[PDB]
Amino acid sequence: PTFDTMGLREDLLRGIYAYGFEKPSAIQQRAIKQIIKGRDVIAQSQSGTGKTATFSISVLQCLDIQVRETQALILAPTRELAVQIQKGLLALGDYMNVQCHACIGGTNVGEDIRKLDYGQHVVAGTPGRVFDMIRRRSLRTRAIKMLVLDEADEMLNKGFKEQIYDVYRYLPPATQVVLISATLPHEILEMTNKFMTDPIRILVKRDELTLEGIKQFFVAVEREEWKFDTLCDLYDTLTITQAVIFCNTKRKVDWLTEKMREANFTVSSMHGDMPQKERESIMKEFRSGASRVLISTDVWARGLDVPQVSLIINYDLPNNRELYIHRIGRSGRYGRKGVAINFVKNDDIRILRDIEQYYSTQIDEMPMNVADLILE
Hints:
- The structure is a monomer.
- The chain is of the alpha/beta class.
- It has helices at about 10-20, 25-35, 55-60, 80-90, 110-120, 125-135, 150-155, 160-170, 190, 225-240, 250-260, 280-290, 325-330, 350-360; strands spanning about 40-45, 70-75, 100-105, 120-125, 145-150, 175-180, 200, 215-220, 245, 265-270, 295, 310-315, 340, 365.
- The protein has a seven-stranded parallel beta sheet with strand order 3-4-2-5-6-1-7, with helices on both faces.
- α2 (about 25-35) packs parallel to α3, α3 crosses α4 (about 80-90) and α6 (about 125-135) packs parallel to α8 (about 160-170).
- Its EC number is 3.6.4.13.
């Protein structure tokens, strides 16, 4: 596992190796790989090598040199550290002729603003100071596309709660937010889910899927051609939120998609026969709020790596009771409660029992009550 296979730009990879960082951790590779994809990330810091570089490498990669204006903003708990981040960023992109500044001083506020105008590609500073420069109309958020909250757990122990929040506000509507932190309190979560849609969590302790908190139901359709109507009947109350509708085969997604679109229905659809860059390209739309109903086959390899949408419709019960959970199960320690409606036909009223019996859970029949879809 190296930096070579990550398709990072040359002038950076040079800096990386020159900086001396020769091989990325197993997890760090994910962090990087994922931040680049654009996903919101929650990486738990661990006493080790360059927990700074890992995200710095990320930040740097995702830049537009030719456009001199603040594109990435990093907040840290201390002036000293804010600087480090800078000295490091500069050292990593020495070969990218990148402009990067750290805000603070007071005796320096003039030099502070002086540089912000020359156009700082990346800015770092304590939440307080950074907010000030934004308030003073000195720091240009307009083109910012990434907010990184380093040592966040600490930022809070030093009570920057509000300032952070305030800074998010000045940032544009869809902004990528990478939070780095050694610990994860019941309040850092309150912040993560408060401005991070379907984030990638990279933790230290095993977090595992479990369907506790999930309301599971089944709509006793009878045969397949009757499924469609049953879906529609539900659909106008569905888009209430987005929804991911599964399926077991390519031809069956394709069918369902076409059949829903010739009926005027905003629907995205992805399967296995597609590109590692168009697939995640659809997702972009979907996690965005740009598409309400996504119909797909089970493509995600990992368990947790499935959209944390609040409503999942197994259009087809899965034929091996160990992925029914893979599909609808949540995170437990960091998951959002939710719903999943199952479409079991007579030939499957059985497979349904096996699943119910397997996870030792209960799957009820859909009540008229869709008003139970009230939850967040």
